[model samples]
Target: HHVGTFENITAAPADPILGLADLFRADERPGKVDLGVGVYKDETGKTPVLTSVKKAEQYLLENETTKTYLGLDGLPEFGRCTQELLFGKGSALINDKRARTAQTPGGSGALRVGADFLAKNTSVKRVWVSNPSWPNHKAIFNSAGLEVREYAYYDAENHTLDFDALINSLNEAQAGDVVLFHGCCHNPTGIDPTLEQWQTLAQLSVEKGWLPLIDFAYQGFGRGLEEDAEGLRAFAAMHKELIVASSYSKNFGLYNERVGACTLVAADSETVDRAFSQMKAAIRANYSNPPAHGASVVATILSNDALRAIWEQELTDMRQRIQRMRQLFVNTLQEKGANRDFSFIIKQNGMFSFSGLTKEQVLRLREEFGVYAVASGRINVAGMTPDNMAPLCEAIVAVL
Candidate 1:
C-alpha cells in the first residue's frame, strides 16, 4: 500500500530567486558578487542588526513577564502601531473605528490569512496580481483555494511600468474582483507609479467596483514611512472597504522574527468588528496565535521616545545608502561604457531594479565572472558595494 505513496510525486523546480542564492553560496571564487537576495547589505557587505532592534530585544528580555499566549490576533499594541504606520497618526480611519488589524507571523502569513478570509467570507471571485509580481503572491493565494490572475504591469522590453496597459487590464475586473498592489518598493522591478498615478488608480479602483489589497512590506525602504504610505491613504479617501498586509522584516531588520499585520477597513465600526471576528476564526484554524517576541519588540520600540528616534535615524541611513548604491552602480556602468541608459534605476525604489540582462547574459555573468543575479535581471541593488562595484560593472559591461 505504501509503495506508490511516495513514488508518484515529482521534484519541484528550484526557486527563481532563493535557488540562485544557493548557487552563489557554493561558488569557490573569492571575488564573487552576489546580487541575488533582497536583504539589505551595508557598505561592509553585511546585513547588520539594527541598533533599535538590539535595544528593544534587550528591554523585552529584561522585563519580567509570563509566557502566556497573546491570543489569535497577537499583542494589542502591535495592532495599534501597525495602523499608525499604515494609515498615519491620528488617522480618521482609526479614530472613526473603521479599521481592524490582526497580528500575523510575517507578511507571508498576513497575505495567506487575508486570502483565506476572502475565500471564506467574501464573494470575491479572483485575486489579481501584477504580471511580474513577487513569486510567492500567486502561490499563497492558490494554496488558499483562490484563483490568481495577472494584470499587465512591467514592460520587459523597456524595463518600466506600462501604465496604460495596467489600466486597460484592470478595467476588465468585475465588481467582486480583488486587485493587489505593492504599496511601495515594488519587488523584482523596483518601479513605482507616481503620486498622481496612485491617485488615478485609487479613483479607478472605486469607480470600477473591485476591492483593493495593498501588500506593504517595504515601508521605510522606499521614500520614507509616511511618504510611502500616501498610496494607501489615497485609496482610503476614496473607498469605504480595503485590505492591507504589512511586514516589519525590511524596515525593522526583523526578518527572522516573522512579524507582520493584516488590516481590514470597513464602512463602519460595526462592520469592522464583524469582519475582524471572521479573520480571528481564520487565524484560530491556522497558526492559532502569532509569535510574541517580534511584536513585543516593535511595540516597545515604537512607544519609547529615544528608541523611536534611534530607529528613525537607522532607517534613514539604510535608505540613503541604497540611494548611494543606485547612483554608484549607474556611474560605474556608464564609466565602463555600457551601451544602455540605466539612469532610470536611480529613480526606482527599494532594493531591486530590473537590470534588463537576458537569461543567456545572466548565465554568462555567473559562469565567467561569478556575478550572481536573477535570470530575469532583477538585481538586489543593496548588494552593490564599493569593493564589488568594479568587478560587477566589468562583468555587466562584458555581458552587454
Candidate 2:
C-alpha cells in the first residue's frame, strides 16, 4: 500500500558541499584526492583520532556503567565543560549567573537550536550571514522559518574581507535582528576580520542593538585556541546578550560523536535562566537530548590536568600542520611560476583556502587531475600533504 505513496516525494538534488564527499567515496582512483571535506587531515591524508581522546575513551570504558539517557539539554557535565571551553575556565560569564549553556548534537545542532529559539521568541525579521558562508548556515535558519539575508564578505579580487560592505550591511540591520558570525577561522573563505574590524563590528552591534550569534566551530584549527577566541570574547565582553555555538568536531577530532554546546550570555541571572528554559524547550522539541559519548570524552580530557595538556598538544600539532600546508601551497605555487600570485593562501588562517577557482575550473580539475575541491573554490588546506603538494599545485595552475 505504501509503495505508490512514495511517488508523492520529489527528486532531491545532491548537497553541494556534502555531495562532493559522496562522490569522493564512490571514486576508485588511487590518486583521487578529497580537498572538499571540512575535517582535518594529517600528512598521510588521514583524519586522525586524538591520542588523548582515545585514552579518555579507554578510561571511560573501564569506569563507566549505564548508557542511560541524558536530559533534554544533555549531561550537565557537558554544558559545564563546554561553557569553560568557550568562555574560559574562570570567565565571569561562567562564574557569575549571567550565562547558561546547553549541549547539542554538534555545532550544527547548536546553530539550529539557536535559530529555533530565535524563531519562537524574537520579532527579528531576518538572519544576516556572510555572502559566502558555510552552506548550512542559510539552510538551518531557513528551516527554522527565518528570512536569510547576506552581508557582503570575501573580496575575490584580493581574497580578503570586505570590511566596508560588511559594516554598511550591519549598520543597516534593524534592532533585535540576529547576525551570524564565525567566531574564528571563517569557513570556506578562511578570511576573518582584523582586530580593528572586529571591534567596529562589536560597536555597531551594540549601537544597532542587533543580536550576535557567533559560531566557534574550528577553534584550535585556526590560530592558537585562546588566540582564536579573542574576537568572540571581545564581542561577549561588550554585548549584553551574545550567543555562542561551538563544536569539538575539529579541535577534539570527534567528528562522529557530535559534541558541541550553545551558550547564551544575558544581562543578568534571571535573563539567562529564562534563556536556558527556552533553549531546553527547543532541544526537547528537536532531538530531545544530545548523545553522551563525545561530550563525555571531551569533559574527561578537559577536566583532568594531564589529559588536558595532551589534548592541547594534539590541537597545537593539528594547527601547525595546517599552517605548514598553507605555507607549502603558497611557496610551491610561487616557485612553479603559476602566473597568478597565490601568496594570499598563506595569509588566510584556517583549514580552508579560497583558491578563486571558478565552477568550470573546479570541474576541469576534477576531471583531468582527480583533484577534488568545493565548487565555490574552497579547498581544505589540510588535504595537501607534502607528497601531494606538487601535483596539487600543478593541477591548480593547469586548471587556471
Candidate 3:
C-alpha cells in the first residue's frame, strides 16, 4: 500500500483552443462545424501536406543523414535560411552582421526560450502583450517568471483596432519594459496594424527605449511572405536591438515537425554574439538540443531554388484561400439577410476573425445550431468550406 505524493493535486482546466477541439470532436451531430481551433484547413476540411515539404523529405531520405543531435543552437543552415526569410536576404541588418538565430522546436518553443532569455539575461522583467492576444502568450511568459501586462488591441464594439488605446498604453510603458507585437496575422483576432501604425510604434519604441519582441507565427498567411515581413523589417531598421520568434508551421505545413527559430538583433556583432551565447545557455538548460529533422527539412527547401519557389507558391495559395473563405462567409451572411452587419469580417486577415459574437451567442451557436466557436467569438476562416458555409450562416442567423 503506497500513498502517492500527487494525490492532492487539483484538476486544471482544459486548454482553451485545443479543449474546444475536443468538445467539437465529441459532438455527434452530422452537420456540426468547428471554427474554434486555429490550424489551417482546406475547402475539404483537411490539413494537406505541402508538396514542397514532401519533396524535401524525399530528398532527405535519399541523401541520408544521421539522427545526431544539433547542439543547443541547432543547425546553422536552418538559422541562416530563417534569418533571410524573416529579415529579407538583402536586409541591412543581415549585411551588417547585427543579428543571429537559434533553431527552436516551434514558435511556442521560441517564445519560451525568448522569454527565459529576457528574464535571465536582460534588465527587462515585464512584457506587455496585446490584450485578447493568443491565450498562450501570457501563460508562456508567466511560466518564465516574467511579469505579464496587457495593452489594448482589438476593439470588439467597432470590430477594429483600438489604435488610440494601444498607442497610449505603449506610451505609458517603462523604458526598459518589453513589448510584444504580432509581425503579421495576429492570432485569435486576426487584426494587424497598418504600415503607418507600425512606423509610429517603431518611433515610440525608439523614444521610450522599450524592447520590441515580434512574434512572426503566421507570416505567409497574411500577405505575401515579403509583404508580411514589412513591419518586422521596419522595426529592425529602426531599433538597435529586438527579438523575433518565427515559425514555419503554417507556411510550410510542418506543424508536427515543430520547426521555428528565435532570432536576436543586437546593436553590433559583439552584442549579437553575447546574446547568442546566453540564448544557447537557456536552451541547454531547457531542452538540451533541438531536433534536427524539421530544421533540416526547412533548410533543404529554402536552400534549393526550385523547392523554395514551390513553397512560396503553395503558401500564396493558402493565403488566397483563406481570403476567399472570408469573402464567402461575409457574402453568405448578407445573402441570408442577417440583421447585423458582418462586413467587418472581410477587413480581418489570416486564419481568424473576431466575429463579434457574444459569449451567450457562441454557446447558443454550439448547443442549438451545432456551430462551434470560441467564447471570445473568434472563428477560423480556413475551416469554412463551400459545403458548410450555407449551414454555418444559417446557424448564425438562428442564433441571432
Candidate 4:
C-alpha cells in the first residue's frame, strides 16, 4: 500500500466569497475595489473596532480571572442577553418561559447546531432556503443530513421580491419541514418584506404547520436594531416553535471573535426544557463549548446601561453610513448615464444590493476595470467610499 491511503481524495472547490477575496488580494492593483466580501467597511475603507467593543475589552482585562469553561451550552448570561436582544425583553414568550438560547461560535455555527438538533430530535428532514441565499445556508443544512431545497425569492428581471411565489412555496411546505427566512436585511438581494407581509407570513406559517428558522445575521445594519427585530418578535408571538440564529459579527465588529447565539422557542416550559437539553448535547458533541472573550464582551456591554447605549449609537452610525453609500451609489450611477436604471440600489437595505448586473458585465468590470464583485451581481454597499465612487461608477458605465 502507498504511504498515504487518502491520496485519491479529490480537491474541493474554492469558497465563492473567500475565493473572490483571495483573487482580489493577489491582484496587486492599488485601485481595485472589492465588493465581493460581506464584511462592513467604513467611509475610510476600514472596518474599525467599535468603541463599545473596546471599552468592553478593557473592562474584561481589568476584571477577568481564569479561563474556565462555560459548560456545553456556553455562557448563560450571553444566552440570556442574546435572547432579550432578539426577542424583546418584555416579550410574552419570555414572560411565559417559552423561549431559550444557547451560545455558538457564530451565526453559521448556530445554524449547524440548530440543524443537527432539528434533524435528530424533530421530524424535520428538509430545509427550504431562498433561491439566492447567503450560499452557505444550503451547504450547512445539507451537511447536517437535511435535504436542502429552494423557494423563489428574488425577481431577477424586475429586480424585486417574488412574494407571491414565496408565499405559494411556503404554503406547500410539509408540517415538519423547516423554512429558513432572513429576519431582516436579506443577504445578496437585501429585499425584505413589509411589516404587513411579515404578518402574513406568520399567519401562513401557523396554517401550514412548518417551522420557521430565522437567520438574523444583519440586524442593526438594516433599519434600527429594535426595528429589525420586528419580524422575529412577530414569529415568536405567533409560532409555538421557532429557531433563530443571530450574529454579532457585523453589528459588534467582532468578525474574528465569532460571537453569536442560537435561540429556540417552544410551546411551553416542558418542551423548551427538553429542546434545551438536545441543544446542549449538540454543542457538547460538536465543539464542547464556545470561546469566552467575545461573548463576555457582548454580555458586559449589554448588561451595563451606559455601555449598551454607546453600542446602540455606534450601530446606528454604521447603519446610516451604509444607507448614505447606497444613496450615493445610485445617484452617481444615474448622473453618469449608465444605460440601465440603477434605482434599485436605494430600494434595498443593509450592506448589500443586487446591482442587476449580468455575469458577463461583472466579468468585464473585473477584467477591464479591476473592480471586484460577486458573479451573482451582489455588491457590498459598504465597500463604496467617497474616494473610489467616481472611478467605480465610470467603470460600471463603461461596462454597460
Candidate 5:
C-alpha cells in the first residue's frame, strides 16, 4: 500500500537512440548492423578498448596502492593532463593561469554539471542550441530549469549547414545567454564549420557577449587533435568567459569508465577560481566525487611520455579509420549508382552522417535488411566495417 505512489505514474517515452538499441537486440538478426547507438567500432564491429588503454590499466594495476578517494575536483594531475589534451601543450589559457577543470562522469556528465553550475550560479535565462542538436542537449539543460532554444544549424533538405539562417537566429540571443557549440566532429549531422566560420562565430560570441558552452565530445575523431581543437581554442582566446565539456569516450575508448572534464575560462585567475569553486559545489552535490579508476588511467597515460605517444598514435589511427570508412561508404554508393549523390557524407566530419534517409527508408533498412539507423537518417560511419559494407550498400540501394 505504501508503494501506491507509483500507481499514478506513467511511462516516459523511450530514448530514441537507446530504444532503437532495444529493438535491434530483440530482433535476433545476426546480420543486424547497429548504426543507431553512437560509439566507435573498429573493423571487427566491436567497440574495442584501445591498446594504450590496456597498457595504462596494466600500469595502474601494478602501481596503484591506495584506495583513497580523490578530492571533490578529482585528481589535480587528471585535470592538468585533461587541460593539455584539450587546449594543446603551449596554450595561453594554461600559461595565463586563468582556467579551471573538474573531472566529470562523462561528457554527458560534464554537460549536466555545467548545467547545474549555470542554473545555480548565474542569472542566465536561456541556452541556445542548434536546431537539430544532440537530443540530450536540450533535455540536460531543461532538467536544470534553464530554458532551451534553437538556432538554425543543419540544412537537412540539402544535407549541409544552414549558415544564413544560423546567423540570423543566434542574433536574437541576448547577452549572458549560453550558446552550445560542437567543438568538432558534430554529432548526427557531422557537419562542422570551416576554421574561418569558427572565427566568425567566435566573433559573434564577443559581439553578442553570449557565453559559448562547447560540448566537445569528439575531439581527435574529426581531425588531428590540435586541428579539431581550433574552434574551441579560438573561442577560448577571443572570449573572456567560455565553457568546454570534453569527453574521453571516443578518443580514449573509455565510454563505460565515464572519463570526462568540465573546463572553464574566465577574465582572470581569481574569476576562474571563484567559478571553479562553484563547479566543485555542483559536483559534490551531484556525484560527491568522480570515480577514480578512469581518471587514474588517463592520468597515467597522459603523464608518461611513452604511453602518451602510444595513445596519440592510437587516436590518429582511429581518426583515419573513420575517415577511410567515410570515403568507402561514399565510393560504394557511387559504384552502386545510388539515385542520390552522397559525396557530402565523406566531407562531413566524425563517425555520424545525416544520411538523409526518410523514416520509411530507415524502417525498411531495419526491418528488411537488418541495418539499424536513426529514423532521422543518422548512421555511424564507424559502423561501416568492410564486412558489412557490401550488404549495407545493397540494402541502401534496395531501400532507395
Candidate 6:
C-alpha cells in the first residue's frame, strides 16, 4: 500500500501564464501571437540564447570533469561572484564579513530558503508583499507557513502605481515583519519604485525596524544593471540586516539551468554566522544542494574580464530591444485608433505590462484574435515583435 493516501488529491488549476503558452502551442492560427510567458524574446519573438552564455557553456564542457556533489552552500566562486554582482564588489557589507551567501536552484529556491530560514529562526511573524506581485511569491511563502499580506502597489483605476497607499500600508508593519521588495522591475505589473520612493522605504524600515527582503530577478532588463541594483544598495547602506534573493535566469537566459543566490546581511559577523547556519539547515531540508552548471557558467562570465565585457554588451542589446518593443507597442496602439491612451506602457519597465484588460476581454482576444495573453492582462512585452505588433495592437484596440 502507498504510504500516503491519494484519495484526497485532485487536479490543480492550470497556471495562468503557462496555460497561455500551452494554448498558444495548440493554436492553429499561423498568425497567432504569444505575449504570455515572461521569457525575453528577440526581434523575431524567439527566446534566443545569449552568446556569452553559449561561450561559457562551451568552456565548461571542455574543462568540466566528473559530476561531483556540491554541498548545501553550493559553489564558493558562484556565491562570491553573485555577492559582488548583487551587492557590488566594493560594498562594505562584502568587506564586513557579516553577510552569508548560498546558491539555490533558482530565484524560487532562494525565496523558499529565505522563507524557511525566517520561519525557523527569526522573530519575523509574517511577510508583506506587493498586492499584484508574481503569483509564485505568495505560493512559496504560504507553503513555508508564513502569513502573507498584500500591500497596495498597482492602481488599476489609473493604470499606475498606488505609491501613497503603498507607503500608508508600510507604516502598519511592526518590527521584525518582512517587507518583500522587488529590487527592480517588479513582476507582472512591471512598475518599480522611484529613487525617492526607495529612500522613503529605507527610512520606514529603519523607523519601524522591519526586515527588508528584496527579490532581484530582472536586474539587467529594467533600466540597466547598475541602475537597477541602486535600490537594494541604498537599503543595504542604511539597514543593518537585509535579505536578497537574486536570479541569473532572466539576465543570463539560463532558466532551465536554475542558478540563483540568497544573501543574508547582519549587523556583525556573529549574527551573520547564526543566520547562515539556519539557512544551511533550510537548504539541506529542501533541495540538498544547488546544481553547478548554471552557477559555474555565471561565475565564468562574471570572473573573466573579456567575457564580462561581452556579457554587458549582450545584456545592453537585450535591454534596448525590449525598450524598443515597449515603445512600438504603445505607438502601434495609438496608430490603430485605440480610444484609450496606452502611453503608460512607456513608463513601465521590464518584460511585462499590466494592460488592465478584463478577463472577458482577454478571453475574447484569445478566441477571436488568436493572441495568447493572461486573463489578468499582464503581457510579456518582450514577446511582441515588429512582425506581430500591428495585428496584435489592432486586436487590442478592438477589445478595448
Off by over 4 Å in 4: none
Please state every model's RMSD to the true fold in angstroms: 1.2, 1.8, 1.4, 1.3, 1.5, 1.6
* TM-score, one value per model: 0.97, 0.96, 0.97, 0.97, 0.97, 0.97
Clashing pairs in 1: 105-258
Q: Is candidate 2 or candidate 4 better by lDDT?
A: 4
- Tens-place lDDT per residue, model 6, 1-400, is 7666877788897666676777788989997988877688888767877899999999999999878898888999998888877788887889998788999999989999999999988778889999899888888988878999989999987888889999898777888899999988898788899988899889888999999999999989888888999899889989999999999999999998999999999999999998899899998998898999999999999999999999999899889988899999999998999999888889988888888899999999999999878878889888888888999999999998
Candidate 3 lowest-lDDT run of ten: 13-22
What lDDT score belongs to each candidate, Candidate 1 first? 0.91, 0.86, 0.89, 0.89, 0.89, 0.89
Q: Which ten residues in a row are the worst by lDDT in model 1?
A: 14-23
After superposing candidate 6, which stretches have Cα over 4 Å from the reference?
Answer: 1-4
Name model 1 segments beyond 4 Å from true.
1-4, 16-18
Candidate that beats the other on TM-score, 1 or 2, i.e. the better one? 1
Q: Deviation in angstroms for 33 in model 5? A: 2.1
Please, what are the lDDT tens digits per residue for candidate 1 over residues 1-400?
4587778899898666777777888998998998877798899988888999999989888993888988899999999999999989999989999999999999999999999999899888799999899989988999888899999999988877899999999878888899999999998788888889999999999888989999999999889989999998998888999999999998999999999999999999999899999999999999899999888999999999999999999999999999999999999999999999898888787999889899999999999999998788889989888888988998999999
Can you tell me which runs of candidate 2 are displaced by over 4 Å?
Answer: 1-5, 16-19, 22-30
1 or 5, greater by lDDT: 1
lDDT of 3 by residue, 1-400 (tens): 9888899889997667677778888989998999886688988899988899999999999996578777788999998888888888888889999999999999999999999998899888889999888788988999889898999998888888999999987776899999999999888788899999999999999999999999998888887888899999889889999999999888888999999999999999999999889999999999989878888999999899999999889998899999999999999998887999988888889998888889999999989888999888888888899889998998898777
Q: List the residue pairs that clash in candidate 5.
A: none
lDDT of 4 at 298: 93
Q: How many pairs of residues collide in model 1?
A: 1
Weakest lDDT window of 10 consecutive positions for candidate 4:
1-10
lDDT of 2 by residue, 231-332 (tens): 898897889998998998989999989999889899989998987898889988999989999999988998899999999999999989989999999898
Cα shift from native, residue 284, model 5 (Å): 1.4
